[PDB]
Paper text:
Here, we present a workflow that utilizes the SPT Labtech chameleon – a next-generation nanospray cryoEM grid preparation device – in an aerobic environment to freeze O2-sensitive proteins under functionally anaerobic conditions, which we term (an)aerobic. Demonstrating the utility of this workflow, we determined high-resolution cryoEM structures of deoxygenated human hemoglobin (Hb) in various liganded states and the molybdenum-iron protein (MoFeP) – the O2-sensitive catalytic component of Azotobacter vinelandii nitrogenase – in a reduced state. Our workflow maintains (an)aerobic samples by protecting against or eliminating O2 contamination prior to loading into the chameleon, during sample aspiration, and throughout sample deposition on self-wicking EM grids, respectively. Finally, we detail the effects of O2 contamination at different stages of the workflow and show how to prevent their effects. Together, we demonstrate reproducible high-resolution structure determination of O2-sensitive proteins of varying complexity and size – as small as 64 kDa – with a workflow requiring only minimal modifications to a robust, widely available EM grid freezing method.
We chose an O2-binding protein, human hemoglobin (Hb), as a model system for development of an (an)aerobic workflow for sample preparation in the chameleon. To begin to explore the relationship between [NaDT] and wicking time, we first prepared deoxyHb in PBS buffer supplemented with 25 µM NaDT (here termed “very low NaDT”). Although this concentration of NaDT is an order of magnitude below the predicted concentration of O2 (250 µM) in solutions prepared under an ambient atmosphere, we included it to ensure that all hemes remained in the ferrous state after initial preparation of deoxyHb and buffer exchange. We then transferred the deoxyHb sample from the anaerobic environment to the chameleon using the protective oil layer conditions described above and prepared EM grids using similar conditions and wicking times as our metHb samples. We then determined the structure of this “very low NaDT” Hb at a resolution of 2.55-Å. This structure revealed that Hb was in the relaxed (R) conformation (as indicated by the rotation of α1β1 in relation to the α2β2), which is the form of Hb with a high affinity of O2.36 Evaluation of the heme pocket for each subunit indicated a density above each heme that was not present in our metHb structures, consistent with molecular O2 binding to the Fe centers. The O2-heme coordination metrics and geometries closely correspond to those observed in the X-ray structures of oxyHb.48 In addition, we used Phenix.resolve_cryo_em – a cryoEM density modification tool adapted from X-ray crystallography – to better visualize the O2 density above the hemes. This dataset demonstrated that during sample deposition and self-wicking, O2 exchanges rapidly enough for Hb to bind it. A 2.55-Å resolution cryoEM structure of oxyHb determined under 25 µM NaDT.
Residue numbers in the entry:
A (entry chain B), C (entry chain D): 2 to 146
B (entry chain A), D (entry chain C): 2 to 140
Write the structure that this text describes.
């Protein structure tokens, strides 16, 4: 549940997000920091070193898709459960991804946003984005509930 | 904690330098804003923005982290008193340490772009988890 | 969701559960094994040693209450969310209990049932009871979702 | 851990004796039944009730736990090859180690009532968590 000011701040910061690199950066950092998540991405080629992970075009292409899904969720903050129904089905029934990894990826994305925006990523903006990523993770984990 | 992790952590926290207290206060503020349930551990604290109590607590936490970095191979012995506090007297829920570690990582990312590479991020995450499990090891 | 076989097994085992000591044993073991949970029960008196915890009349009475709530949830397996609405409000918006402790207490209760029933607590019965305790914990943590 | 934890764990696991393989197989069966998502790590395994593959894997896990008990103060060095396996090749999610530890605790409770006191339960929980974090150390 975001207040109108939190929503305005979130949508103002998201408008300046590079949609071609932020998702790839978040996915690569997830793979580097929690390398058991690499088990889900063996078909992505070389993942042995952090440089190879962040240089992987498949990781960049997938991160772009994940960032697009996050943008879709951000455009539907009041219908997150219905927005992520098919993605929840895919991630739970088909891929067997533990729901703690959703929270991990959301926190990695928060860290990536902080890294890119620096001082303008204020604590109130981060709190609103934590609300957003918690909602997204909860919506994606619904099929386990 | 591999030796590579220790090497990465020492340089990254060395470039923190004299901004450690400010970074700790900012991480505490971020934790209080993002996770208000953590505020229940500080009922006697003035927890508004710019609070001198929060500033002093951030300096203390930053100094503890600096000592932990200086004693990375002997952290359980170096943090015995803090573990005693946090586990016996405070008995803080271990999820709060994950929350504070995440806020510290966010502060470091927002203040040190060049230093916050993915490998340094992984090393800092592992170091903060080790510090957290040392501080909860007395349970 | 439980199959009719799982429901029958769970009901048959729960009919033999001693409602005066099982909840107290579960609460005491939760306090001993996860001593940070003692922060929520500082008005119960002496909790300094495991024997003092297991001999605490306040802990025994509160465990009786918790076991009664578990029986209430077991009598309504398709409406756990509505069965635990007020308890969820109390535990989240009033007590600020982190939802991981709900799963911890459910697993402690499973261990207590295994301890009491021995070979009767077969792996299928345990799987059904894990489903039950997961549902109860999810229903109790609804206010955080 | 603590000296008391080590003593309790040593006594409890000594009381396991020659039923270690049976207890490990039963814990594996309990984990597969209660948490079917753990089955994805064994796609080449016959995972039905009474399976000889599950029996052998349970014997191996029990022997590893016995070695860890015998080397409780040097567990990270004693379990280096197993941690290498589980972290590099297998890449097991850490949540799965919590699930297996819970199933081991359930098996121990259902087979050793007198030994499974609250203090022994706490010590076994701590020991299994230490084994799990050693086996996930390489990440
Ligand atoms: C937390 C928020 C997440 C979002 C919004 C998200 C989004 C997506 C999207 C949009 C797709 C592509 C679906 C399609 O093309 O039809 C996808 C697939 C996938 N996701 Fe995620 N994801 C998340 C978390 C995760 C995590 C944490 C993991 C693993 C640890 C993961 C593993 C995968 C995999 C392996 C695929 C490939 C599925 C396939 O190729 O069929 N996801 N996800
Ligand atoms: C890396 C993690 C942490 C470090 C390094 C740390 C360090 C410290 C230090 C140095 C002190 C002061 C000790 C003294 O003055 O003698 C302290 C006190 C305290 N800490 Fe932490 N801490 C951490 C995590 C946490 C978390 C996550 C919480 C709660 C959510 C917490 C709650 C407290 C409280 C309530 C006090 C007492 C403050 C007072 O009474 O004035 N700590 N900690
Ligand atoms: C997981 C399943 C749980 C169930 C079914 C349950 C059930 C209950 C019940 C029936 C009450 C009494 C409410 C009343 O008398 O009005 C209660 C209160 C309480 N619960 Fe729980 N509980 C659970 C978990 C927990 C956990 C894990 C903790 C702490 C770590 C906790 C802390 C408390 C406390 C401190 C109270 C007393 C507060 C008050 O009465 O105002 N509960 N719970
Ligand atoms: C209590 C902690 C655990 C211990 C002590 C343990 C011990 C072992 C041992 C001794 C082996 C055999 C290695 C060899 O042949 O030399 C093994 C293999 C394996 N373990 Fe574990 N393990 C543990 C937890 C887990 C968990 C939680 C999973 C995942 C659900 C897992 C999945 C595997 C797999 C997939 C293999 C390879 C099986 C094969 O190909 O034969 N282990 N483990």
């Amino acid at each position: 549940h975001l207040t109108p000011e939190e929503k305005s701040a979130v949508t103002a910061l998201w408008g300046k997000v590079n949609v071609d690199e932020v998702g790839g950066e978040a996915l690569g950092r997830l793979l580097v920091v929690y390398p058991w998540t690499q088990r889900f991405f063996e078909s992505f080629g070389d993942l042995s070193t952090p440089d190879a992970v962040m240089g992987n075009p498949k990781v960049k292409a997938h991160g772009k898709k994940v960032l697009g899904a996050f943008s879709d969720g951000l455009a539907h903050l009041d219908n997150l459960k219905g927005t992520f129904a098919t993605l929840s089905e895919l991630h739970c029934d088909k891929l067997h991804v533990d729901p703690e990894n959703f929270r991990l990826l959301g926190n990695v994305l928060v860290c990536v946003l902080a890294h890119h925006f620096g001082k303008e990523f204020t604590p109130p903006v981060q709190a609103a984005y934590q609300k957003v990523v918690a909602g997204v993770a909860n919506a994606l984990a619904h099929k386990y509930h | 904690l591999s030796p590579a992790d220790k090497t990465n952590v020492k340089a990254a926290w060395g470039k923190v330098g004299a901004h450690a207290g400010e970074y700790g206060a900012e991480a505490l503020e971020r934790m209080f804003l993002s996770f208000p349930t953590t505020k229940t551990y500080f009922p006697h604290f003035d927890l508004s923005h710019g609070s001198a109590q929060v500033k002093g607590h951030g300096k203390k936490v930053a100094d503890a982290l600096t000592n932990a970095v200086a004693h990375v191979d002997d952290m359980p012995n170096a943090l015995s008193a803090l573990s005693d506090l946090h586990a016996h007297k405070l008995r803080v829920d271990p999820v709060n340490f994950k929350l504070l570690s995440h806020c510290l990582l966010v502060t470091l990312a927002a203040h040190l772009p060049a230093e916050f590479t993915p490998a340094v991020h992984a090393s800092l995450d592992k170091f903060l988890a080790s510090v957290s499990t040392v501080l909860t090891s007395k349970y």
